[PDB]
């Protein structure tokens, strides 16, 4: 079903690389059980450097997480945007471990917005990245928070409308 389709890495990448946003990754590698987010960040610090806004799209199994690393101003801060059920504490501290490498408290923003947007984790990632790019110098923690709160105030018909419109734009990048 296209209406409840979970976005893959390539499908999410094609949309997010369309106009610093890193390629979508899995949090923990299945076989070697390494923290890919930690390894990716470490690799970054040794090469050129971390942008003023580092965006990671991290998959923790069924979640697409918006992971933002940003400086404000002398202190770098970490931001986790979850649009589904609350992450278990195990998954959380794998992110905290990666946050420390970036040079960091880890701000987990967790609000379930997918009651009417099935597997919409990738959809909110695509949409909020556009928000953060239109927000500029605005505090990203309050950009995403007020967006999620306002999204819950919408009716089912409006939420479902967001679901089909966003998917029609995202699917275009993969075609």
Are the beta carbons of 19 and 51 closer than 8 angstroms? no
78, 121, 125, 127: the active-site residue: 121
Closest residue by Cα to residue 163 from 130, 128, 114, 125: 114
Q: Which residues contact 86 (CB under 8 A, 6 or more apart)?
A: 110
Q: Which residues contact 92 (CB under 8 A, 6 or more apart)?
A: 106, 108
The total number of structural domains that make up the chain: 1
Q: Residue 141 and residue 151: Cα distance in Å, rounded?
A: 16
Which H, E and C letters describe the chain, residue by residue? CHHHCCCCHHHHHHHHCCCCECCCEECECCCCCCEHHHHHHHHHHCCCCCCCEEEEEEECCCCEEEEEEEECCCCEEEEEEECCCCCCHHHHHHHHHHHHHHCCCCEEEECCCCCCCCCCHHHHHHHHHHHHHHHCCCCHHHHHHHHHHHHHCCCHHHHHHHHHHHHHHHHHHCC
79: its two tokens: 């931001």
Q: How many residues does the chain have?
A: 175
Which CA distances in Å does 41 have to 5, 62, 136?
A: 29, 22, 23
The one catalytic residue among 63, 67, 78, 125: 63
| CA–CA–CA angle 108, 113, 114 (5° rounding) | 120
Told to judge if 78 belongs to the known catalytic residues of this protein, a careful annotator would answer no
Residue 153: CATH number of its domain: 3.40.395
- Label residue 135 exposed, middle or buried (CB < 10 Å: 0-12, 13-18, 19+): middle
Resolution (A): 2.4
Which residues on neighbouring strands pair with residue 108, listed in sequence order? 80
Alpha carbon 119 to its chain centroid, in Å, reads: 13
Q: Is 121 a catalytic residue?
A: yes
Say how far apart CA 35 and CA 45 lie, in whole Å. Answer: 16
Q: Are the C-beta atoms of 94 and 35 separated by less than 8 Å?
A: yes
43 close to 54: Cβ distance less than 8 angstroms: no
Q: Which domain holds residue 17?
A: 2-173
- What technique determined this structure? X-ray
Peptide bond into 73 cis (omega under 30): yes
**What whole-number distance in Å separates Cα of residue 106 and Cα of residue 100?**
9
Q: Which residues touch 52 (CB under 8 Å, ≥6 apart)?
A: 70, 71
């Amino acid at each position: 079903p296209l209406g409840s389709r979970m976005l893959s890495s390539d499908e999410l990448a094609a949309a997010t690389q369309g106009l610093s946003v890193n390629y979508p990754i899995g949090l923990i590698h299945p076989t070697t059980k390494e923290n890919i987010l930690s390894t990716q960040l470490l690799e970054k610090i040794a090469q050129s450097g971390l942008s003023h806004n580092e965006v990671f799209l991290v998959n923790t199994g069924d979640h697409w997480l918006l992971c933002l690393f940003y400086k404000l101003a002398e202190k770098i801060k970490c931001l986790i945007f979850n649009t589904y059920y609350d992450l278990n504490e195990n998954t959380k501290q794998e992110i905290i471990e990666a946050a420390k490498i970036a040079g960091i408290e880890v701000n987990f923003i967790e609000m379930n917005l997918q009651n009417n947007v099935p597997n919409g984790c990738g959809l909110f990632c695509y949409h909020t990245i556009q928000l953060l790019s239109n927000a500029g110098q605005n505090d990203p923690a309050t950009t995403l928070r007020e967006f999620a709160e306002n999204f819950l105030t919408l009716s089912v018909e409006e939420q479902a409308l967001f679901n089909t419109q966003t998917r029609r734009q995202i699917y275009e990048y993969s075609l």
